[PDB]
Design a protein around this ligand. Sequence first.
Ligand SMILES: *C/C=C(C)/C=C/C=C(C)/C=C/C1=C(C)CCCC1(C)C
Length: 137
Amino acid sequence: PNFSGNWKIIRSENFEELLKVLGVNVMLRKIWVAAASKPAVEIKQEGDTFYIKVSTTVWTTEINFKVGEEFEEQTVDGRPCKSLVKWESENKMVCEQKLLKGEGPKTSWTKELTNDGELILTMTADDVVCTLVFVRE
Ligand SMILES: *C/C=C(C)/C=C/C=C(C)/C=C/C1=C(C)CCCC1(C)C
């Protein structure tokens, strides 16, 4: 349906846990989830094609994909990867990520629109699941 919107975050869960598995050391994680961990997500959708903009106060990243087509992006912690999004339901999609170079935790993310107006991102590294919940602006 209409994933498109200007999304403001309302709930974070396990974001520091995620960062830990990803290997960001302690002081870095703590300091990280501080004044720059309340992110804005902008979504413009046209069919199976997605344009996404995620930004803090000094950083912004653009993610562009079509469902079913490989692309390149970033892991949550900054490492470049190849990604592929699939649908798992009418309102939910799943992305498997494979690192470009190196090794590290197995990462993935999902994007779901609840019928109640919540946009729900999850990000997974090995067995830790960070859940972010947004509502529109
Ligand atoms: C469909 C929505 C997607 C793919 C959203 C992805 C969001 C991120 C990869 C967020 C990354 C973040 C940073 C790069 C630093 C600030 C903390 C986060 C989680 C907002």
